[model samples]
Target: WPFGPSAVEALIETIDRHGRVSLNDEAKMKKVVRTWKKLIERDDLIGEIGKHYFEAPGPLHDTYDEALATRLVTTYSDRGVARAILHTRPSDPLSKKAGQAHRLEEAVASLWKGRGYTSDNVVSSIATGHDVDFFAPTAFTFLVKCVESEDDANNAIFEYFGSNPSRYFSAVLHAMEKPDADSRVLESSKKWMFQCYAQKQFPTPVFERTLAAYQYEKLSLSQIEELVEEYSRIYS
Candidate 1:
């Protein structure tokens, strides 16, 4: 379905500026999805827009399509390429019926790179939700690295991590090395360890880093073991 790529950019920029989205974009996204799903299948496209035209939503796509990028590339056969280009549109939450998200992605990339952004302007119309494909971890990390306002940084962290937990955690680990980082990541995570069934310590750095984050002071060695157990339960 060429419902097209979602711009969701304006939505994310507002989040970058205010620390949270207003849900207007989110609401509009659902409407877009419903509309896109209905049309991307109807075309024999002439110039299918390439995802190369857009940044993978920061880090989410880093893990999602990575080199494969749902750009849906292919050479399995000429027919295959044709099928992908003319007949396939990945299910996206906010793609325009004709692929306008690229415009928004480009806009966010522009803003995320400069401090003069404080006075800059681009699409002021609030964009809808940013699917992982449009959200920018690279820029969010940049914001985390650059912003000094405690409230703004903290609020953005919550928005960033809340938007994507696995991606957010990875960003936190990588952020450890920034020379001037003024804040540690803080997010609400699970709480409590009812019963400890086993106890094995961990890679010293993981445990060490866990301490650098929040709430570790409350864990007993047993609870620490429980945390490890939970991490193992689903960690890839």
Candidate 2:
């Protein structure tokens, strides 16, 4: 996907940090927020929003919020490109950083849900707490993949937290029983099984259990075993 470059960069910088929680002191917060705010305030922040926000969803820094995005100095700038699409609505109080980007993709996908929204309005939505940002992307992707054969689009995951294949694949399985899932998710889970557990050759009874229905025609026991043994690894 052509998104989340900043998300990828941020996580890489904080390689030692794990899970999702905001960690910053007054100086760190000021520096980090200022850096982010400055990038947003620049003339062309749509791509930054697209590359940084729309490209993927790791963390959204709002209401003095930060993390997942961490304190990284992610950036960009391009004019006119945003004016055509972002000017669809008007929002003040969010600075240039909070542009039409917040809803550009969704607008493309279907309709403009947040037409008269502001930064405060935008921030008001979603499952709060650290895990909301942490879980929603894959959880819903798995949800979409379970019923349909297409999954690559669904795989446009928040790469920042997509660090563990086991968790991702496990999420895919949960989607499996739910029915009406994506074929790619099911097939991809096989790859993750091998890749994530590869070299280690460990057995997750749950993995086998989730695939029980898809086996035979879709995947074989030995095939799964070999993959579990064996192309044996992964990406963001």
Candidate 3:
């Protein structure tokens, strides 16, 4: 949700281009390695924020301190505002460009909101733009809504991924055998989903970590995303 699929894909492409594999091009290798290190730092910062908000959720006193709030601000903030949040260098062209991309994402979200969908739904939908390998934000939000109602998040996930709505709804009803369920069990099921997602090699963790480090260092998101893609492509 933080970085859409397109952003992730771009990162992967960047890494694949800049990173060293078996090749031994010293100058290029050094450049990419430096870039990779920067990306790692960025990721660590974002990851800390994510773990804090999603895993802890208590200490972040203000609503603005929440992960959702950070995400919304990061997604919607103007280029100058976003650049200020990240503390990017004034001379950094890449940082400036990242601000533009964030502006685009905000614009897209605004467009969707104007169309009458909840901002939450629009945010979720736009996340799909990050990776082609995973579900779109629309599909992901559908599962989230289902989780709000169903006892079995796994069943809801299965149904959402199963097929078209007509068949999926039938499957959901067929799977619902109980109402009183253990919240811990449901939570564990969600953890399994996360594991499944990891195994599927979605770029979320990488993106989060990269974003975190960048945010912590006050690096621009546009710059970070650009470097991320460049380095990811080199490595791949």
Across 1-236, the per-residue lDDT of candidate 2 in tens digits comes to 47654643553344324224456677566666655664556556545445554444565434222221122212211112122233433344565744434433233222112234322222222213332231233333322222222233223332322433434444444445454455564666545445444455545554454335332014445645543334323311
Highest-scoring model, lDDT: 3
- When summed lDDT is taken over every stretch of 10 residues in candidate 1, the lowest stretch is 119-128
**lDDT per residue (tens digit) for residues 85-115 in model 1:** 2233324546564243332233233433442
Per-candidate TM equals 0.21, 0.24, 0.19
Candidate No. with top TM-score: 2
CA error at residue 190 for candidate 1, angstroms: 14
Over 1-236, each residue of candidate 3 has an lDDT whose tens digit, in order, gives 59655533555545556442536678676867765665576554445444544644443233333344345555664333323322322334456575544443344334344556553343233333322112222233233342343334344444334322222222222223234333354444434443443565657546447345423013345644543463345322
- Please list the C-alpha lDDT of all candidates, in the order they appear: 0.35, 0.37, 0.40
Candidate 3: stretches off by over 4 Å: 1-94, 118-132, 135-236
Q: How high is the lDDT of residue 233 in model 3?
A: 56
